[PDB]
């Protein structure tokens, strides 16, 4: 009954990164009714339709926009295109001028490479900016560290995991002392 706030704000701040995990493993008839008005828009984030969903939000929006100051939703109204272009980063490399530009509701040469470059300057993605005949290419290498500097990759994973599991070993050494303390 209380975790609907940390879960609600949790998914609200999780859908900003483009990947929004819905309610999968928890079955309780409180977060369902809490998420019923938010479900249409949190499902509408991934598709990323600007003009339609812009009217869909304020259309039936009462409580999630009446929560106050509409800050993160007024940032979401222009974050739809950033999560959409991040889905383009999860999509193929070559960017066309009509197919994918018309698909992204943005048909112009300047703002295409300009806003895509605004997504490149973030640092969360990887691209190869090259201009040979006018088209903008990208290497989009999202290959994981498998056989690519593994020791430096999961080195901190081994150190941190052994630190947490080792302080858990302390957490299984001390409670036995708190057991044998009285006898």
């Amino acid at each position: 009954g209380f975790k609907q706030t940390v879960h609600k704000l949790l998914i609200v701040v999780e859908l900003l990164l483009g990947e929004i995990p819905d309610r999968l493993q928890f079955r309780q008839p409180s977060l369902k009714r809490s998420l019923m008005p938010y479900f249409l828009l949190t499902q509408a984030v991934r598709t990323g339709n600007l003009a339609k969903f812009n009217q869909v939000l304020d259309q039936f929006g009462e409580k999630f926009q009446a929560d106050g100051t509409y800050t993160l939703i007024i940032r979401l109204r222009h974050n739809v295109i950033k999560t959409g272009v991040r889905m383009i980063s999860l999509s193929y490399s070559r960017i066309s001028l009509a197919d994918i530009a018309q698909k992204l509701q943005l048909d112009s040469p300047e703002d295409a490479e300009f806003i895509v470059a605004k997504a490149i300057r973030d640092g969360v993605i990887e691209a190869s900016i090259n201009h040979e005949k006018g088209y903008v290419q990208s290497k989009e290498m999202i290959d994981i560290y498998s056989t690519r500097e593994p020791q430096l990759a999961f080195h901190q994973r081994i150190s941190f995991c052994l630190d947490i599991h080792n302080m858990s070993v302390k957490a299984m050494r001390f409670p036995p002392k708190s057991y044998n303390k009285d006898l």
Partner: protein, 70 residues
């Protein structure tokens, strides 16, 4: 403290007082087909289902016409 849950439960009582058993039955129209089904798969099936609810829901009957045209 466990005492701050009371006003949140009052907000849940207000949400329950908005519609009286309207989302339970109206949403139960789909829950009767969703009951006892793994809700982990209902996120993908509901994702593609709601994604195709606008247009090109089935699209398999149209491929037979799209073979000669594309």
């Amino acid at each position: 403290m466990s005492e701050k849950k009371q006003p949140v439960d009052l907000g849940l009582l207000e949400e329950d007082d908005e519609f009286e058993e309207f989302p339970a039955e109206d949403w139960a129209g789909l829950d009767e087909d969703e009951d006892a089904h793994v809700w982990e798969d209902n996120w993908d099936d509901d994702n593609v289902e709601d994604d195709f609810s606008n247009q090109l829901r089935a699209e398999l009957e149209k491929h037979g016409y799209k073979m000669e045209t594309s």
